[model samples]
Target: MLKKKQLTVLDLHPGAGKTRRVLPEIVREAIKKRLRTVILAPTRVVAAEMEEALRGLPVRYMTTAVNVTHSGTEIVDLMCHATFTSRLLQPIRVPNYNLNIMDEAHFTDPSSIAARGYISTRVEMGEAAAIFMTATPPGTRDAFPDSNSPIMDTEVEVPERAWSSGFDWVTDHSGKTVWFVPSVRNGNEIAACLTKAGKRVIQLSRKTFETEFQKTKNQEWDFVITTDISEMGANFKADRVIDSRRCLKPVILDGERVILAGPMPVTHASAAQRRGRIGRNPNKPGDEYMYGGGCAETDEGHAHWLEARMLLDNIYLQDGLIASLYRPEADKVAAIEGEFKLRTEQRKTFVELMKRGDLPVWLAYQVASAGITYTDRRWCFDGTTNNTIMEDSVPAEVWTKYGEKRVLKPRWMDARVCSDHAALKSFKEFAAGKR
Candidate 1:
């Protein structure tokens, strides 16, 4: 019986303890083992977070030995150098790397150059440490906040199967003027409720998508009364998302522990996407509430299997292969889009991942000859070679990744600026001239 590998990931450190205890120990161990140390994180805030935690440490982290690869001023150094830009950036090279600490280790690839700077072309790296930090620790994507900040003194009382609870089991927001309104079942009732609350409620419909959304936002209307794009694009910087999940699980909130979003009708995906509205500090109501229709399945589980395959292909190739039905047809199938699923979706994901700049130039070649062209973004191969039906375009990001293409930032995710024709022309010209 092939026993599954244990998670082995023990998140024992809070904010500083993670790096304080582990970093120094790892550094000492690396020195002892004649290895180098590398650390990676997901967001800049998170990377800065680790750095801040270790700020007051006994040892000096300012030394060049401890490299911080992040965007903005935190980078302190540029890992990869590109002449141009696109949707994603490629990892260049890190000098003298023996131990690597990938903060957001999940994205420790060429595409994640922005996050994890490419330091070295030739990697003689040994053992590495991946310290993952998020409000919600790995497992079930309820998207709720769980001990994200070290200041969060509360601990979730975990059951054999339950998570821990935080401090402030429940608190009141005095002087917090949240609009108190009634249920939205009828138009007149909604109008009356808004009128009584000194607000106007525009009934949302698909037809008036842009107009309705703009009106609600432009007017700076709070306590919006609609179930349309208005909710989708609510300036959450001043509003909150009230997701009454239509599925069977309590949606997790990383914001205010638990939020009570205002009156909203029955809907699922809309509810989830709405949570992204206003955020901490500036947003009027920073948290979302899952009212009435509670037992709905949270958006965490609302995904297609093929999409999973696509995500896997871009992120975890080995795992994607182990469970996927489609393997790379040739050496250059871009990314691992999973074993079996919709060919088009798989191919698109592969291209998007490649274009986003995580995989290496060599790997991109694997896909270009295999299925990478402008045409087939939805095909997958089974580790075979050469029998592709469609052709795909080599995204500018991929070219930039290999020093073959270079654009500027500001337009990394731009769709049409650097056309396939433009890229191919440059590529052909470059090839003809031979660098």
Candidate 2:
């Protein structure tokens, strides 16, 4: 494929030995041609796993913790997506790599900084070959617009399993099971419930996923409670899988904080990935338990639309413009620009109001990033702060006062500001119902 085309998408199903069978051959071929290869994984654990799988091959796995200096002798450089993007930010010279293989390419949505870095790097590569391997290809024209680059899909025949609903089955199931939960808090709650019910359970979250994942393999627990973090690469064997239909994600909508909760619908691709977590052992018939109603739908290109919008907002804040791999259509660019304009206007108004209240410039920027609105003659700001925004832009005093905590009522609205009564009154009418 690389001999004919510069770009290719390998859309293979999970458990299809993409990492084991296909990637090794590709690496070997690149070595034969004396070409360097850069393989990007979505997470460090996944990259580390890849490093282990290709142990005999001349591969250097790079991460922040363990600095393995790259040597010219290595055929492949394996690193996480963040590390690859960080290199782009440094404005470093592009490494001499002929092939770029991105595993789980869906993670690099059009709105992501990773996508921007990938685009910029590809431009530098010119005619160099690139392969995107993912079980769930976005298939959006806006994201992957090149018509000549073919998406090679491999079909796999999967075994059928028993299907059920709710958490009742967990108490009775004797075999090792994987219960996918919506959130960390929810997973902890479920784990506690199962533990109290005399069933051994291990809960895994982003903070403790890597360490806890190792424990899951020891068979100390009857059920492994986890979030979508384990959806992609970690192959923990289980007799059954309990997939919760509900998930909660906090997103900025029109520059206001909003939490999308409840039984959010999922694409068939996502459901397939979750299903792939189980049914690995052909001898033992596995089961699938959809906790809420099975809400899997056909793949729509915009499944990650909310995430893309959030990424766009963040990029606009930092760069003052939107970017894309290819030149976006006029209407799409117009829509993004319009939203950016609206956010800019809101930011300016909020900054001026904060200035009148004698707030510092850094404080103004921090508050504006969270979005502002007015209701009942009082100016309101969304005080939702995260580690990235706090560490990068917020001052120490501001973070100490409002860091790691939501300072607003309803969590998403109204961290009321009483400063500059006259200015507040002036903007109150302008910002009415703006949230």
Candidate 3:
């Protein structure tokens, strides 16, 4: 690999061993050149572990301090001795280190403080190139693209043997277990019994994921439970993974907030992230035990009567059983085709609604281009009636016929169901909670 003032993204499959294979060489080179380096990880556990791997180097682990100026100075001094910090800490100090690195850079969103820090540190013209590395880079491309960004991107796939065993076998054999739940609430639900049983069950949410792991990284736990947030960055010392359910959440498109009517299949990318968690820890031995299952309970004890069970039996576990589910080359072609088809339908429905003078141009565009449904505590899955607007559900509706009396249809859930502009308030109140 060429070393210079350049942005390089080393996209690999989880457990392909970036720390073992790639990081050491870079650290050695940076040290030799006396080019002080500052590395950022998405989680505390990751940052700490990364420091461990760079033991010989002058490395110090840190976090964001309350005083912005103090933190910046501390950061500068720390990096002067080769410091490692969280992505959030990057924005605090613009020290202009010679080398900048972000592990699990995928976790940094466009507006995240970490994203800002990365850009500020990377764009400096004085040989300050940053390396963005992760098994799963958000989507197929580099999330932070620039003229300096490297064109070469690589992906490592999960081996087929990884899916050859059940959860019971892996747990009994390996003696350590980790499971991924789609949501924090669902993870808590799963860990309740283990907690009551006097077993050491650790549940890691967005709030507790990093700190909790750092607290007990060296200790032993009967069950380590976490949500999708732990999928890409945080490293767990477990050999079994019960990827229980697909993790698809929400979206607000155009001006309307809508949930997809049917049970959506979990994509291959998520499964890969979960599978990457296992088979990595060098201290751990024996093959990883992996099982896929689903559990979600609602008003009738579960999200839907038989649907949840059916999904678990079919969509959830079926994909997990086959390790080689994603064909990148074919997926690219299909993605282009899928985008075209999705836009085609949205365009047709939008123009139709506008002709009928149902929703304003802004509202109509929002309705048509809506990306994904937002899943919150308020949102529940129901096969009983897709028509029922759960709280602020509808913001806009499509009309097949225009005029004083219109043939209205819900463009999102189902075209067969129709409603009027009075139903658009929920659509108007569709607020997304993401930065």
Candidate 4:
């Protein structure tokens, strides 16, 4: 396909040979053309697999697991999304790669810093052909709106599955199973319950995912309870998969654990990925059991799912805002502003913030200038004490009356931006010799 086309989007099934065959062929073609290629994976495991597949080729693998540096002259550079995005923030020049391949491209949205940086640095860098490959390409359309590449969908038969509660699957299933829970606490609790039920269970955590997952290949355990840490790269050939629809992502706030949005149903893409974990062997097909009435099938689940989607969409906008602070490209900022205009409340608040010159950029600048370590992703003040503050923490005097009414709330303001506002207030008080 790349012989003629400048861009391509492959929407293939899980076992459709997209990764095993198509990607290697693409890299070989790029190498034949003497073009520098960059392959971006979503996780370290995926990058490792790519490294293995592209072995003997002129490829430089870069990941946080090892201290790997790029020569900026390799024919192929393989890296995870985090490493690639971090490199974009560095003061160095972008590598001159003629081809950029983003595997599992749906992991990022159009407004994320990674997506934006790719557009500004690679796609717009001239003569760079791009390829986006993903088993699930739900958000690819929005991410690459200008690409004329046709989505080459590979049809695969949906495996047969049995539906049941979490307990039922753990107790009734006979062979080794992979139970995906939402949080670590949930996994621990589920592991305890199953262990007490006399079923051999192994709980996987962030610290032990790799070693424990590797053990599963040789060792036998009735149940392996884990979080989404095993969702992407690790292949588990379990007899059944128990997908707990409710997902909880907790973060530290005010020096305490806080569930960011409480438990929400998993997204469609996640559900598909979870289901694909099982049914790997065609001869001995396994079933997928739904624990919470499946994703967004119930009323409460639907509401929570929509709220989760809104939160994710807002993240893109917030990320775009922060990216603008670092690299203020007019087209990208305008693109973000155009997205903001699509929503009534966002449009009103965005216009108001732009008019008053009180956008997050100014607050971020103040926080940085004050020498307070502020992580935009966490949207918190980090130092001796990690204090998480939001828009409501800012004083009314600091905001206009309308801004106070409309913008000084959690729904509209990103927590990171809110922390910036709160940091600005603290900075002002200190400047006035009040704090």
Candidate 5:
């Protein structure tokens, strides 16, 4: 309901209709004010789709009128290769004439090469204040944290839990194997197959921007997959990540994880980043699976086993708000309780985070503080439950130390079980392949 001439953002669930509801008004105002607005995403597919959305609108991406990053790298950087006449173009031209609409401003820290280049370009152009947008603003609040030794600021964000989702508050284990498939070309197809078998479907796509996203008209896919486009920049309702076992190749589909935390290898900059996701769902146990098609053979296989083991062993996660499962022995229960007290002492930050939007943190605080007991992934349900609540194959918990009721635990599987630092994949070592 707020408006501004310089910049304004419509924050909503990642797929909750920002483009259709919010973008049109802004773009219309931009045109009325004769503002040259530029939309940015991390990939070409998203940039192209954004341009396509404004196809018939008064605003368009022409040489000087506007620029689309997808049109080769020339428009973005005014330079040409070895022997070319385009050498005279100013290094930072596009940003000079247009207003930048950064899709995921959170990714623009100066420490990384990509963020540094972006910040340099922005400073050189000095057209006006650029509008930064992001769903999961990196924990480091400043979009661009470069060599400047910028002040360390925090993004106090939390997920919201509106009601007591008091649906049959019991722990249920899933024999329901989730196979995360990578590859944009095949992700949707595979998700559809999984969905056909009575599983809840959550589909995210980077192929569509907020404006064009509604075109699907609330259409749902089995698995909500998104491209590293603007869609990834916005935090939507879903919090589960089932990346393809094939894509376990690297941290590619990382931007989509929000309220629910992400994995050790998915978006890992360090072990620290891996721990960031857990605070969101600390109370309600969650699931994080790694799917690999037992294809690697030889030393590669052994290497993968080690990686899996490392991920499981050194997830580097610690919490305080919830209490651990009580083992029958007095010593075991006492030790876990001490850990619980220590973790509870540490949960002070989570409380600070909740005011801003730490939905997960708030949710965990709400559940665990109410007396839910924590269970390591080693939990198994008694025979009263029909599902794999007792499956030794998978780690289920009788109760979570966090949420309102019993919750299942999320785990790393197969190759993803390996530590992120582990280099198990067959990467392209070709001399020229270096980025």
Candidate 6:
């Protein structure tokens, strides 16, 4: 199968059972070649589905997080297997197997250098041989806080999962408010509870679709609680729109941890999109209130807690991988010089190791700038130190190097932009003198 086909594209309807019926042949072929294979999925749901379909076959697979990071011996035995985007993003080290098979290939990012680098390294080492893939069917979906239009020219959706919790404030003073919801059950419950307060509630479900669709146009219904109908293709002049979700997983940014109500496994994109339903007329302008709906007392809260905990768990795992691969040399090079130039021999091996996955760019920047180099033979130190080199002592060399996509230099920052102390010591002294 690998030798016969270089690439294959399949277009199917949404929710089609093609992968369930297919991929078994590819798996069998991989096993026959005595090759270890991985079937990567775009989403967790798809990964689980593929695993279910491949059951009763001679496949040895492990989908647990622990099993993924553990020894490659048994995992390698899963000659045919499945894993998700999260597992693929992890810098898990594994032996290159005979085959790599990716499902939902359309969703895979070309810039996923980490995944590509891992497979390529083994292929070079003769540990693995072929890479095959299947493209997922495209769908029409748009997101809130979204620049991409599913209708046409769209921004690439980033890989993120978000949840929100608790009630969010809605400020719409002109007309009425609408609570655009995801599930019909939630909508009905909200409608019942709000009606107790004597508020007009229009529950828009598949059954009541046409009746409630026109009811939404008039200003009579104070609040319209709905399912898919409100997702798109509707316009209204409401004072405000309300939606709810739980907190999303935390991500590391600028040495801090934060979560946004971004994307999740939910059917729709960010709830922010539903909130866009408000202020459409420009006559009765309104505000969007996105409620974070998780509470420690509810099942939603429990799921939120577990998801947040796993984010922290996985973060630590990736951190360990970085430390093991790139930290010592990083520590060895800090504060050595404002700029350390890499000589001929130093540049060659540093670039090579960087390409081979042994050296990370973050650590490479530090080590190379510290005048240390990893030669093909071994690691060696360049003798230039906190040297007699002064600012402007030598002309600056601003140029790009192979494998270094970005040229990290202060050259790009405008020399005039001042991001310094608002007051100098001289100014402070002068102020005290005036006092």
- lDDT tens readout by residue for model 3, 1-435: 325556677876566667656886876777677776766665555655665666545554454421122323222122211123222222234445676666665452212222423333344333566676766553443221221112222222211122333423323433566777555555666577456545577877654565677655667788787766776466666656666545433322332333322222233445455656666554554434343432232112111211112111111112223111112221211111112122435555544433333333333444445642222201212223443434335322222211222212233342111222323332323211110
* Of 4 and 6, the candidate ranking higher by TM-score: 4
Model 4 ranges off by over 4 Å: 3-5, 64-73, 108-113, 124-127, 139-169, 205-208, 249-259, 296-435
Q: Where does candidate 4 have its weakest 10-residue lDDT segment?
A: 140-149
- The backbone clash count of each candidate, in order, is 73, 0, 11, 1, 46, 15
The Cα error of candidate 6 at residue 1, in Å, is 2.6
Stretches > 4 Å off in candidate 6: 4-18, 65-93, 108-113, 116-435
Candidate 2 Cα misplacement greater than 4 A, ranges: 64-72, 108-113, 116-126, 139-168, 287-291, 296-435
lDDT of 6 by residue, 251-338 (tens): 2223211222222233223343354454344333224444434222111221222222222222222222211111111121122221
**What is the TM-score (0 to 1) of candidate 3?**
0.49
Order of the predicted models by lDDT, top scorer first: 2, 4, 3, 6, 1, 5
User: Which candidate ranks first by lDDT, i.e. highest?
Assistant: 2
RMSD of each: 16.4, 11.4, 15.6, 12.1, 22.2, 20.0
- Highest TM-score, which number? 2
Q: Assess each prediction's global lDDT (C-alpha) against the native.
A: 0.31, 0.51, 0.43, 0.49, 0.30, 0.38
Give the runs in model 1 whose Cα sits over 4 Å from its true position: 1-7, 12-34, 55-308, 311-435
- Give the TM-score comparing model 2 with the true structure, all chains together: 0.65
Model 1: per-residue Cα lDDT over 15-100, one tens digit each = 22444456545545544564443444333324444555455332223323246443332212212111111212223333333444
Better of 2 and 4 by TM-score: 2
C-alpha TM-scores of all predictions: 0.32, 0.65, 0.49, 0.61, 0.32, 0.31
